[PDB]
Amino acid sequence: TDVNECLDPTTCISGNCVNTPGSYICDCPPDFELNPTRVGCVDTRSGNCYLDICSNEIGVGVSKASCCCSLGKAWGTPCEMCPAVNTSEYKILCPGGEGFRPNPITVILEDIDECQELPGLCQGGKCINTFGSFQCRCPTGYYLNEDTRVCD
Numbered sequence: 001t002d003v004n005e006c007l008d009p010t011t012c013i014s015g016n017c018v019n020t021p022g023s024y025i026c027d028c029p030p031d032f033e034l035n036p037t038r039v040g041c042v043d044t045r046s047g048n049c050y051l052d053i054c055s056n057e058i059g060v061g062v063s064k065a066s067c068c069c070s071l072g073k074a075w076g077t078p079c080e081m082c083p084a085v086n087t088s089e090y091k092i093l094c095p096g097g098e099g100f101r102p103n104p105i106t107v108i109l110e111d112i113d114e115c116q117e118l119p120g121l122c123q124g125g126k127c128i129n130t131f132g133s134f135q136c137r138c139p140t141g142y143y144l145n146e147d148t149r150v151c152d
Contacts, residue, residue, distance in 0.1 A: 013040030013107050014092040029092060031064075040107035043093070047076025049118060051149060054079035058120020058149060065101035066112045069094035071121055071149075099132030124151035 005024040006017035015026035015034070028034050028041035035042050042065075049059030049067035054074040059067060067075040068082030068090075075082060083089030085098070095102060096109035103110055112118075114134045115127035122136035125144065138144050138151035145152065 013102065014095050015041040032092070035107045036105055037107075040102065041092075042102055042104050042107060044104050045076065047080075049120070050074040050079070051120065053081075056120070056148065058123075059118040062117045063101060063104070065093055066117050069096075069098065069101045070112050070114055070118060072118065121149050122151070123149060 004019040005011045006019045011017045011024060012026035014032060015028050018025040018027060026034055026038060026041060031045070032041035032043050034040070043063060046061040046063060047067070048054070048057050049062055049070075049072040050057050051071070051073055054077070059072065062075075064075045064080070064082075066072075073082055074080065083093060094100070099112060100109045101112050102108065111129075111132060113129050114121050115129040119127065121127065121134070122144075124142065125136050125138040128135040128137070136144055136149075136151075142152040144150075
């Protein structure tokens, strides 16, 4: 009775909780929809990921979270800008910070695999997925353009 679940930190991941009599509700911000078990909000659209303003594509048909919670800079068509790291937009979009996205079904944070989803981050080179991150080794005689993410 006296209970308002919204007062609990965790209630409604990336969402706005509204306390109802015996439970509560999660209203999802724009572009987010409630997950199946209704514990949070996710963006299940698929789009391209870009390294600049959209240009320099590094990922295809990938989720905005996987794009922007990573090194991506813009996403989808029409080109949307990844929110900046100190924003609320980013708090919601990247609830686990840099390197992770929420599972569309369970909303559980998982390590984004740039190697698979964002192959662009290492064009012409070997991509090695790691915890919350990944590496890149350019083949002998070629070097990584830290700006184009291309080997040489």
